[PDB]
Amino acid sequence: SALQTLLADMRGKIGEIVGIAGNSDQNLTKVKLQYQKAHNELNETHQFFASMLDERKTELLKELETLYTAKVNSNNSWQQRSRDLIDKGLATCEAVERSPAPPSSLLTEALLLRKSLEQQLQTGI
Amino acid sequence: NESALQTLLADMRGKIGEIVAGNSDQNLTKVKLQYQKAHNELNETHQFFASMLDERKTELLKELETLYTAKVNSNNSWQQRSRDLIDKGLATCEAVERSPAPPSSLLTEALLLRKSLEQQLQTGIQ
């Protein structure tokens, strides 16, 4: 009976193991599918961040082209306005320096041009 | 009061001179090189992180295969040990039950197997 209890115990555990062994082929399948699924998520995730990095890069390149263009245009317009002010400033100086009697319009023009040259030089920042 | 005029003129000529700045071609060149450098830095950095990202993926993938292999091996090992314990466990019970008088060594073996069965069943819980 202590013996019969031992045997019954062993046979009980044997039966339990037999049960909890399940279909061992089926279990190997759940594991394979679990792993294939995790591998795919890993790939999606990697592909997600790679697309992220690509897209972010091309947007910055686009922002960079835009700023560059604005800079080039900003320098050209400044250059052109300066040439126009310099031609007028000089002509106005020469007209004044040779005038028998500087007309009020010429003196006004000198004053306006002087102001504009100051803004143009200040805008040289 | 013709000194106000000369001060005006010199002032204009001074500001004109200060403004006179070019060479705008050299300046355009400075701008082009600064933009190319920033363009190339964007590409290097992107390429550097993309390779870092690949390296990370291959590490995670390796950690994944390893866990997978360990689990498959862990389960194959449990199943096969179970087949052998069931086989041995059954035979021992049959030997014990058929014995007119079970030797102590046989009974010691039964006690040992009983313990092994308990362990196999416990680690068979997930």
What resolution in angstroms does the PDB record give? 2.5
Minimum distance, in Å, between the CA of residue A81 and any CA atom of chain B: 11
Give A43's contacts (C-beta < 8 A, 6+ positions apart): none
Which residue range is the domain that position A46 belongs to? 1-125
Assign 3-class secondary structure to B21-49: CCCHHHHHHHHHHHHHHHHHHHHHHHHHH
- Which of B48, B71, B117, B123 to probe by mutation at the A interface, max A CB count within 10 Å? B117
CB contact under 8 A, A3 and B96: yes
CB-based contact B99:B106 (threshold 8 Å)? yes
Can you read off the two tokens belonging to residue B31? 């701008």
> What angle, 0 to 180 degrees and rounded to 10, lies between the N-to-C axes of helices A104-122 and A24-98?
150
Angle, alpha carbons B118-B104-B122 (nearest 5°): 5
DSSP track, A50-116: HHHHHHHHHHHHHHHHHHHHHHHHHHHHHHHHHHHHHHHHHHHHHHHHH-SS--HHHHHHHHHHHHH
CA–centroid distance for B21 within its chain = 55
Q: Under a CB-based contact definition with an 8 Å cutoff, are residues B3 and A109 in contact?
A: no
Q: Look at chain B and report how many structural domains it folds into.
A: 1
Does residue B9 sit at the A interface (CB-CB below 8 Å)?
Answer: yes
Token output for A17: 């193991």
Backbone angles phi and psi of B81, in degrees to 5: -65, -40
SS3 state of residue A30: helix
The span from the CA of A4 to the CA of B102, in Å, is 12
Task: Provide the token pair at A116.
Answer: 């504009």
